[PDB]
Design a protein around this motif. Structure first.
Motif, PDB file in Angstrom:
ATOM      1  N   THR A  25       0.858  -1.169   0.000  1.00 46.99           N
ATOM      2  CA  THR A  25       0.000   0.000   0.000  1.00 46.99           C
ATOM      3  C   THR A  25       0.903   1.230   0.000  1.00 46.99           C
ATOM      4  OG1 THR A  25      -0.008   0.284   2.404  1.00 46.99           O
ATOM      5  CG2 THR A  25      -1.689  -1.156   1.455  1.00 46.99           C
ATOM      6  N   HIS A  26       0.273   2.393   0.074  1.00 49.48           N
ATOM      7  CA  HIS A  26       0.959   3.672   0.135  1.00 49.48           C
ATOM      8  C   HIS A  26       0.576   4.169   1.514  1.00 49.48           C
ATOM      9  CE1 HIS A  26       2.416   4.551  -4.019  1.00 49.48           C
ATOM     10  NE2 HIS A  26       1.490   3.675  -4.356  1.00 49.48           N
ATOM     11  N   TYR A  29       2.768   3.438   4.540  1.00 50.51           N
ATOM     12  CA  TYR A  29       3.935   4.299   4.592  1.00 50.51           C
ATOM     13  C   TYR A  29       3.656   5.752   4.960  1.00 50.51           C
ATOM     14  CZ  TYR A  29       5.422  -0.037   2.802  1.00 50.51           C
ATOM     15  OH  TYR A  29       5.619  -1.391   2.709  1.00 50.51           O
ATOM     16  N   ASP A  30       2.467   6.217   4.605  1.00 54.06           N
ATOM     17  CA  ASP A  30       2.042   7.545   4.961  1.00 54.06           C
ATOM     18  C   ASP A  30       1.850   7.563   6.474  1.00 54.06           C
ATOM     19  OD1 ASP A  30       0.939  10.223   4.392  1.00 54.06           O
ATOM     20  OD2 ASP A  30      -0.904   9.344   5.223  1.00 54.06           O
ATOM     21  N   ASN A  42       5.959   8.789   0.631  1.00 56.42           N
ATOM     22  CA  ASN A  42       6.675   8.550  -0.628  1.00 56.42           C
ATOM     23  C   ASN A  42       8.120   8.097  -0.414  1.00 56.42           C
ATOM     24  OD1 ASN A  42       4.911   9.269  -2.981  1.00 56.42           O
ATOM     25  ND2 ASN A  42       4.951  11.315  -2.099  1.00 56.42           N
ATOM     26  N   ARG A  45       8.134   4.614   1.471  1.00 59.42           N
ATOM     27  CA  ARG A  45       7.753   3.495   0.614  1.00 59.42           C
ATOM     28  C   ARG A  45       8.887   3.123  -0.302  1.00 59.42           C
ATOM     29  NH1 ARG A  45       5.266   2.027  -4.174  1.00 59.42           N
ATOM     30  NH2 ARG A  45       3.611   0.488  -3.963  1.00 59.42           N
ATOM     31  N   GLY A 185      -1.668   7.649  -4.858  1.00 58.47           N
ATOM     32  CA  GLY A 185      -0.360   7.077  -4.633  1.00 58.47           C
ATOM     33  C   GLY A 185       0.711   8.135  -4.596  1.00 58.47           C
ATOM     34  N   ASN A 186       0.329   9.306  -4.117  1.00 61.66           N
ATOM     35  CA  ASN A 186       1.249  10.413  -4.017  1.00 61.66           C
ATOM     36  C   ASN A 186       1.080  11.004  -2.630  1.00 61.66           C
ATOM     37  OD1 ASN A 186       2.997  12.582  -4.446  1.00 61.66           O
ATOM     38  ND2 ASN A 186       1.807  13.488  -6.136  1.00 61.66           N
ATOM     39  N   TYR A 187       1.670  10.353  -1.639  1.00 63.68           N
ATOM     40  CA  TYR A 187       1.565  10.834  -0.269  1.00 63.68           C
ATOM     41  C   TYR A 187       2.823  11.643   0.063  1.00 63.68           C
ATOM     42  CZ  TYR A 187      -2.450   7.685   0.197  1.00 63.68           C
ATOM     43  OH  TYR A 187      -3.677   7.085   0.056  1.00 63.68           O
TER      44      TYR A 187
END
Length: 189
Positions: A25-26, A29-30, A42, A45, A185-187
């Motif tokens: 996942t993203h 990591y966020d 980002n 990850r 998908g851009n954290y």
DNA sequence: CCGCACACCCACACACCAG
DNA sequence: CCTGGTGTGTGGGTGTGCG
């Protein structure tokens, strides 16, 4: 920009092992970024994916409720066997199994004849439906690798798109259907 | 005078609702 | 949960630029 310390890397690794189903996942990591603020979802990850993954070695096993498995004293269980992730990909077998099921459905609908023998229930196509009542609910029960929602969308977006007959001729003529569909998908900071 | 840190991409599995 | 419209964010990366 900030460098990843050994301490932080070991923290990221520990978190992924205790949440293995979320490894790709993203959001995992966020969330990690909340504890190691010098970094972002980002960078965490990517750091994990490209650098730390070669050091995973093992994860901890989780049960069917997505929770970690704990023993009598509260200890965890190591495993080199990754649990299933959040999303499961469709296989060629699955696509064929679905297409055939739908074809049989339409056949029974149109001809009131059993496709297997020819018994009276009293080819090709280019029709969307209608889809029989609880078709996907029962398809999912008999083939639980995907939920009723997943199977239905796979039918709508891919099968109906590629064509039922076309996919059946293709599969038999021997893989899964593909590419028939703020940026996610851009954290960042 | 380049490797790491971080941004961003995007098809799509899986989901939910209204009409 | 019949159909269609449409949201979510995963999964697997690639693009960018700092120090």
């Amino acid at each position: 920009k900030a460098s990843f310390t050994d301490e932080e890397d070991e923290f990221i690794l520990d978190v992924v092992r205790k949440n293995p189903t979320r490894r790709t996942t993203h959001t995992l990591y966020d969330e990690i970024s909340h504890y190691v603020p010098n970094h972002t979802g980002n960078s965490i990850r990517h750091r994990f994916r490209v650098y730390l993954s070669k050091r995973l070695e093992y994860v901890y096993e989780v049960d069917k409720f997505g929770k970690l498995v704990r023993d009598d004293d509260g200890n965890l269980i190591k495993t080199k066997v990754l649990p299933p992730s959040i999303k499961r990909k469709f296989s060629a077998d699955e696509d064929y199994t679905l297409a055939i099921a739908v074809k049989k459905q339409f056949y029974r609908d149109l001809f009131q004849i059993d496709p297997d023998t020819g018994r009276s229930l009293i080819r090709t196509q280019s029709r969307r439906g209608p889809i029989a009542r609880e078709f996907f609910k029962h398809f999912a029960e008999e083939h639980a690798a995907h939920t009723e929602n997943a199977w239905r969308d796979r039918f709508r977006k891919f099968l109906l798109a590629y064509g039922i007959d076309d996919y059946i001729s293709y599969y038999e003529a021997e893989e899964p259907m593909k590419n028939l569909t703020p940026t996610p998908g851009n954290y960042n900071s």
